[PDB]
């Protein structure tokens, strides 16, 4: 398979990956220590039914408080869109 | 500029980003606690300088020992190839 990577304001119409930064403190996800922000990206474009959606995801390593007075470092899956495709 | 994202054995001749897993444990980089391996990717393909090279990079968050008996969590830049292009 083949994926496409675009900038914002590109003229590509096909299903493409675009940049997007997620900001945990902006949503009040207070229990996260780091990172406070990260580039998650997102998918958009014509698939002409099938739609443009993540076909590959990658993890990020996070430092956060849990429910049990612990601080966790852990690899959290499914956090970054690595590729977009029609499905 | 538009980037392409390939699987291994894709048959694409153009400049494209391919998957690649870096394994710190395999190279004995013993000051790194986590992650022991991660998806860095790489760039390969024809550009008809111009050479197929990374054009966007992403960090990873790492846990490691330093020179001063300390354990460090930090955002390490330039660790993941996010986009490949001809330049």
Numbering used by the authors:
A (entry chain B), B (entry chain A): 1 to 48, 71 to 109
What did the original publication write about this model?
Growth/differentiation factors 8 and 11 (GDF8/myostatin and GDF11/BMP11, respectively) are two closely related members of the activin/inhibin subclass that share ~90% sequence identity in their mature, C-terminal signaling domains and ~52% identity in their N-terminal prodomains. Similar to other TGFβ ligands, GDF8 and GDF11 are disulfide-linked dimers that are initially synthesized as precursors, which are cleaved by furin-like proteases to separate the N-terminal prodomain from the C-terminal mature domain. The ligand dimer elicits signal transduction by symmetrically binding two type II and two type I transmembrane serine/threonine kinase receptors. Similar to other ligands in the activin/inhibin subclass, GDF8 and GDF11 predominantly signal through the type II receptors, activin receptor kinase IIA (ActRIIA; ACVR2A) and ActRIIB (ACVR2B) and the type I receptors, activin-like receptor kinase 4 (ALK4; ACVR1B) and ALK5 (TβRI).
